[model samples]
Every structure is written in structure tokens, then in C-alpha cells.
Target chain A: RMKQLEDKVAELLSKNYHLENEVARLKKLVGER
Target chain B: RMKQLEDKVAELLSKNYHLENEVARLKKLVGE
Candidate 1:
């Protein structure tokens, strides 16, 4: 059970990292007139 | 060019479109 949760959390963290990068790119593209 | 960009962002009304309801519905369907 612990290993499964660790893997899931790791996956979510990775997704969050990608989300951050995407958000930055979006802000640069859209937010910067 | 005697016009000062005649449309100064018109209120940034991203929500001004009548498609707001449709977009909200889609947003609801897609679970976060």
C-alpha cells in the first residue's frame, strides 16, 4: 500500500511540474501583449 | 492613422461572450 501511494504521489508531482512549465509558457505568450 | 487603437481591450470581458454557459458546461463535464 505504501509503495502504491508513493508512486501515485510521484506521478502527481511530475504532472504538477509540467503544469508549472506550461503555465509559465502560457503566461509569457498570452499575458505579454 | 487618426485612431488611438479604437478598442482599448473593451473590458477584458473574456466572460462577455454568450458562450459562457456552454463553456461552463464543458468545464463542469471535465473533472479536475
Candidate 2:
């Protein structure tokens, strides 16, 4: 049982794409706002 | 398909109950 957290991290990282633009956007927004 | 805001990440890391606490609620205005 990898758990939903395992699922969650994968799902997030899929979009993360090696910390790609989507992830960057997140950081940018968080950093600024 | 959890209808998260697509806000920040999968590592909300603690609470998954509040939208304000979705990811980067660094404002810490976020709830427990």
C-alpha cells in the first residue's frame, strides 16, 4: 500500500515535469504573493 | 481526480481539507 500520498506525489510530479513551467509558476506565485 | 486548485503541488504535506491550505498558504492564514 503505497498510500494516497504516494499517489498524490506522483500526480503532482507528473505535472511537475522535472519542476517545469507549471511548477515554476507555482513557485513564482508563491514567492511573489 | 481530486478537484484541487492545481495551485502548487502534491505536497500539501499536512492538510487536504481547506482550499486555502491547498499548497502555498505561506500566508499561514491557512487553517489546521
Candidate 3:
């Protein structure tokens, strides 16, 4: 269970990082236009 | 099993939102 939670959190963090990058990209697009 | 995965994803999304918000808040604080 602990290992599962660790993997789950790791996956979550990876996705979260991507989401943050996506939002930053959108912000840059809006700013440039 | 699929439902469980869906639920896990949902919770991860919620935490991600909060994490993003927290980072933005900190950036604002530093920017000012």
C-alpha cells in the first residue's frame, strides 16, 4: 500500500508538472498575442 | 478497477490545481 501510494504520488507529480507547463504555455501565447 | 483509477486521477487533479495555485501565489508575492 505504501509503495502504491508512492507510485501514485509520483505519477500525480509528473502530471502536475505537465499541467503547470501547459498553463504557462497558454499564458505565454496570450501575452504574445 | 477502472473506477478506482478514475477516482485517483480526480484527486490528483485536485492536488495539482492547489499546487499550481500555491506556486502562483508565491510568485505574486515575490514579484511584488
DockQ for all models? 0.02, 0.10, 0.15
Candidate 2 displacement at residue A21 in angstroms: 6.2
lDDT of 1 by residue, B1-32 (tens): 11222221222222233334444444444431
Better of 1 and 3 by lDDT: 3
Predicted model with the maximum TM-score: 3
Q: Model 1, A5: alpha-carbon shift in Å?
A: 0.2
Off by over 4 Å in 2: A18-33, B1-32
The whole-model lDDT of each prediction reads: 0.42, 0.44, 0.70
Clashing pairs in 3: none
True contacts kept of 1: 0.00
Selected candidate, larger TM-score, 1 vs 3 = 3
Q: Which stretches of candidate 3 lie over 4 Å from their true place?
A: B1-12, B17-32
Q: Across residues A1-33, which tens digit of lDDT does each residue of candidate 2 receive?
A: 345545666675554453354345565666666
Cα lDDT tens digits for candidate 3, A1-33:
655766776799797987677567656655665
DockQ for candidate 1, please give it.
0.02
Report the alpha-carbon TM-score of model 3 versus the true structure: 0.54
Which run of 10 residues does model 3 chain B get worst, by summed lDDT?
A: B23-32
TM-score per prediction, in order, is 0.47, 0.27, 0.54
